[PDB]
Nucleic acid binder design. Structure first.
Lengths: 205, 85, 82, 80, 62, 90
RNA sequence: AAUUGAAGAGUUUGAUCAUGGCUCAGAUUGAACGCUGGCGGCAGGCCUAACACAUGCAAGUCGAACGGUAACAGGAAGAAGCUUGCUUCUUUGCUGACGAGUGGCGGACGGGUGAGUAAUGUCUGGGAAACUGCCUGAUGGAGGGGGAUAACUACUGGAAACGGUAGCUAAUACCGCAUAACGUCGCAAGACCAAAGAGGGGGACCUUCGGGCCUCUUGCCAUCGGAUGUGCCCAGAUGGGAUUAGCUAGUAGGUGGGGUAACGGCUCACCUAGGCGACGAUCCCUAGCUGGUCUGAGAGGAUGACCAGCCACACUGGAACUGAGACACGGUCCAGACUCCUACGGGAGGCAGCAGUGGGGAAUAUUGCACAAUGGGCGCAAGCCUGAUGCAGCCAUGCCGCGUGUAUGAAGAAGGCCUUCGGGUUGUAAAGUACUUUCAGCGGGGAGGAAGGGAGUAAAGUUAAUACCUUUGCUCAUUGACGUUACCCGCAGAAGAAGCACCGGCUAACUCCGUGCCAGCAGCCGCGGUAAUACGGAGGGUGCAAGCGUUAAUCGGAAUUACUGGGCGUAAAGCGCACGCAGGCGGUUUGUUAAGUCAGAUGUGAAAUCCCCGGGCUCAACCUGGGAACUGCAUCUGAUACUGGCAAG
């Protein structure tokens, strides 16, 4: 119920890298990406409209490992609120704890990030939280437990994520891991390779 | 069953034995009044009606007969005699 | 004999009550005359734990109501000067 | 004022009583077309006054009979 | 009524308390039900490792 | 558990609320108990006194009037399987 | 701020366009079944036979109503061991308490089920001819006497259940009498009706040594009102069938007597000869209704489980008693069926109350724990009882959260599956390396759910009294079923924890081998006749996930019942044609009414549920604040176009 399988095989089924196995070897090269998801993944299909909706739905799914039952809840939540459902879906999904753990750089991969979160080593706002689907509410802060701090997983996350693009709507302390999260995640502040109308069209029926 | 509030059965039997006797005491006095109305002699009808009136109002205090029923039985009698004579 | 008692709502081990005016014969969570206020016994630190409708409880006094045990105690807990 | 109807006298082949008919132009629930929905009421009145075919103010009262529970106020529009 | 016997190699006979679930067996005229294998006296299919939720074969031991 | 306790005067039921040592009583309930079972007091030292299991002898067979009673045949004889030690089913 | 909301695909033909059904893609479930299965939270868990039920419990309490005390513990005059006050015991209802009974109140509430019930009911909105324990306000009284009767006694009947006979004592039990009013009756004058005493403390007078006397607490009965509940009437709404056309005879209404808490054919007497019916009477079948649940863009369609209001039933059928209220679940009586005890004479009972059983069925649980909190009954209170309720157990049935590791890692391993056999794929997936270690396993800490109540004390009331009682602060010791709780802290270790379906098109995802219209697959179209991506087995790949499919079920898609929103020349469908009553609709002008209609106001539209901005459990499901909403309905006051009624042209 997490994913628990061979990891980059999903990235070769999606062609590009979704930064799922970043780690020490920050070059992907030992993966043979794009043209080999299986014994007959060395070709190309005509790839129907249902498929291009599903494969796009699979990519936004696989970066954060959200299962379909949990994933559909967001669509029920995004369409419930105001604004655009294309914008609301990713916005409430950015508020996931492991998403803000990754965006603040406490984790180099989401599987490495969630292992910190599920083992309750993060004191967000004054209370330690072990459930990664916790909504990190606007205008808040997030701290790390000092009595389990810096055991060579945090420092490597501090090294690599400071080479990677330095995210926007939040501030990293970078000395002793005191993350602060400030504003609403905007559509322009995204990876932008993902589409949004592919998803909300699929979830109408 | 053999619940110890089954005395309410025999507490009702001595109660009904008290009632039906005194309930018939009222009704028989109404019969004496009604017999006089079939008779038509006024003083016999008046005195009987003047006799059972304390009997009717008393059982209303004991609650065996409702006040308005006791008020009805006053209004029954005096209406019958007045139209007669 | 209309009384002012408590009706228990909520889940297991995390109770909640809303103090209600009801006919005393009827059930606890059932048929009631009027809800007047509520009470939380595990009221985590926010100031809202009880919002008792004091004036109708004072009005039902004149109508002959019997204020129950904890309902009277909650009025002694949430005083008539605050 | 008080609740009083209009009606129309229908069955006056009996004594000190009348069955009146009151018209209700209700809207149909699903089809939206107004139907002349009739309603017949056993209505009590005083001593035998009127005949058929006359609009009659009638108000609710005590259950004077098994069915008759309304009282005729007045007779309007005497005709042939 | 009638019913279809899925899989192959059934140990059915003259009298057997079995269980019946509905389903059109279109190629057979006038047969509208399926005997559910994994139930009572109609036993499981002799080894079938693929799609064993239908035909009621258990998972092989390992 | 211990559901109900009965002194059992020849399959007659009178209720016992407490049992002493050396008395015979029937415990009602007791889903998984067998013959000669050493019922001891838990959260305390555990004792044992059982050593015997007698012999079976003649095995015959049966078949009911129809197959619609075969589920009861395994059940009612299974109801008899719990009772007697020297009585097996094949 | 509170609806930012509506998709389609396959399938007739050689091919096409339509008409047109069948099927799938979605959601949902009180679900069962197959395979698999780690934990936690909130939920739900007999839909079928209202089938028959073993056992334990599901309703008692009151000594502040009373005679008494059978038990238990006491001060107590005393008894006897004899360690002369250490104790064995005898007195004794004189104390705190208290079975058995009389009496008071409850048991008509809660809890259950949906057979009956198509309208006696229910939802909605109104009314008049009423009654209403307990709780409450006001106005007064609360005088004086009597005869029995339980209990218990002496005898006695019986196996018990339960008695029967003769004596006997009390009562806030019962029965008169006095005396009545803003009360009942009566045009009036008048006539008539009630009540009970208990508990605490005590200055002083009086003590027949009880008490009276005073104060306080409470109860009592009468009348008019409040509140709450209840009975009742009326309008509309509330299923399918016309292969169900006439129906009804206390039936439709009057009058009078009686009945009724109150209204009435309610129930009789006599009279009148009527009442209901095409806007569907009567009859047959099925069904509890509603707030709402599910789906749907909406309108509608299906449905009425859980939670809440109402109604009906309590083994079947009938009747009445008692009482404030029942024609009564755990009451009575009788008839019937079915079981149980037995001494054979005679008695006993009703799980559609919580568990639990056999049975029926695809299908559903523990004879569990505590009266700690909320609520109820009785009581001054303390307390007692409470299968209501709060909790625990079993069951992935459902919803929600979480884990079975993370990173690194190429000889691109071995092995397997392929290869035009050069390679590729599985696959950085494993090993190995370094870390993290939640939940489970284990050892220690640790909330809150608990407000109260008990004894004492001070103060204000309070009264002739600093007493009592009442209120108020105040101190001490306490009240936790669940529960080795929620939560927290540390120990050892990657270590205890991943499946099920599909892969021809629909529809995301392919090869090889076996097999040859066989074995079988399949929701639809359709595949298999020796090169099968559809059959079965591997490998590969996709989907979903502690679940996943199969079946059943409802709506959707279905604008294939079309009100919104379909058609009728040939696709299914103009009666063969015509006259015509009910009924539907109706040219034009003025005046009038306001029924329909529309605008505003008012009452209500129970709560919850649903939706929005918030709050609390670490998140979430979930519990919860206010609001919106409940689009309705009824009443009231207006507007006079349009439709209708009326009058005239």
């Amino acid at each position: 119920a997490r994913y628990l399988g061979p990891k980059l095989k999903l990235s070769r089924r999606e062609g590009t890298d979704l930064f799922l196995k970043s780690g020490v070897r920050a070059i992907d090269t030992k993966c043979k990406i794009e043209q080999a998801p299986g014994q007959h993944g060395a070709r190309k299909p005509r790839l129907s409209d249902y498929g291009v909706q599903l494969r796009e739905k699979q990519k936004v799914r696989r970066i954060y490992g959200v299962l379909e039952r949990q994933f559909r809840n967001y669509y029920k939540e995004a369409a419930r609120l105001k604004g655009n459902t294309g914008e609301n879906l990713l916005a409430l999904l950015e508020g996931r704890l492991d998403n803000v753990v990754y965006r603040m750089g406490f984790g180099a991969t989401r599987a490495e990030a969630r292992q910190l979160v599920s083992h309750k080593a993060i004191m967000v706002n004054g209370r330690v939280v072990n459930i990664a689907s916790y909504q990190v509410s606007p205008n808040d802060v997030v701290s790390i437990r000092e009595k389990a701090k810096k055991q060579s997983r945090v420092k490597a996350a501090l090294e690599l994520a400071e080479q990677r693009e330095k995210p926007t709507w939040l501030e990293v302390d970078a000395g002793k891991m005191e993350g602060t999260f400030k504003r609403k995640p905007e559509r322009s502040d995204l990876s932008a390779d993902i589409n949004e109308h592919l998803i909300v069209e699929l979830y109408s029926k | 069953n053999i619940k110890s509030a089954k005395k309410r059965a025999i507490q009702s039997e001595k109660a009904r034995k008290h009632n039906a006797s005194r309930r018939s005491m009222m009704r028989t006095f109404i019969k004496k009044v009604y017999a006089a109305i079939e008779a038509g002699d006024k003083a016999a009808a008046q005195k009987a009606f003047n006799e059972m009136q304390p009997i009717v109002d008393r059982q209303a205090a004991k609650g065996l007969i409702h006040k308005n029923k006791a008020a009805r039985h006053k209004a029954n009698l005096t209406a019958q005699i007045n139209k007669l004579a | 004999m209309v009384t002012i008692r408590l009706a228990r709502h909520g889940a297991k081990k995390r109770p909640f009550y809303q103090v209600v005016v009801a006919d005393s014969r009827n059930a606890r969570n059932g048929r009631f005359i009027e809800r007047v206020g509520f009470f939380n016994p595990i009221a985590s630190e926010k100031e809202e734990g009880t919002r008792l409708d004091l004036d109708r409880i004072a009005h039902w006094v004149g109508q002959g109501a019997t204020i129950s045990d904890r309902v009277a105690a909650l009025i002694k807990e949430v005083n008539k000067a605050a | 004022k008080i609740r009083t109807l209009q009606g129309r006298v229908v069955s006056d082949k009996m004594e000190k009583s009348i069955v009146v008919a009151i018209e209700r132009f209700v809207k149909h629930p699903i089809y939206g077309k107004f139907i002349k929905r009739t309603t017949k009421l056993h209505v009590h009145d005083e001593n035998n006054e009127c005949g058929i075919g006359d609009v009659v103010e009638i108000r609710e009262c005590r259950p004077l009979s098994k069915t008759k529970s309304w009282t005729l106020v007045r007779v309007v529009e005497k005709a042939v | 009524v009638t019913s279809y016997i899925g899989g192959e190699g059934h140990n059915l006979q003259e009298h057997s308390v079995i269980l019946i679930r509905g389903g059109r067996v279109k190629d057979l005229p006038g047969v509208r039900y399926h005997t559910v294998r994994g139930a009572l006296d109609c036993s499981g299919v002799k080894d079938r490792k693929q799609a064993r939720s239908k035909y009621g074969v258990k998972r092989p031991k390992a | 558990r211990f559901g109900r306790i009965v002194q059992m005067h020849a399959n007659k039921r009178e209720e016992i609320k407490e049992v002493r040592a050396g008395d015979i009583a029937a415990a009602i309930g007791l889903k998984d108990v067998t013959t000669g079972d050493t019922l001891c007091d838990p959260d305390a030292p555990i004792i044992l006194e059982r050593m015997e299991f007698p012999e079976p002898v003649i095995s015959i067979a049966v078949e009911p009037k129809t197959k619609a009673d075969q589920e009861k045949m395994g059940l009612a004889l299974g109801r008899l399987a719990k009772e007697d030690p020297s009585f097996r089913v094949w």
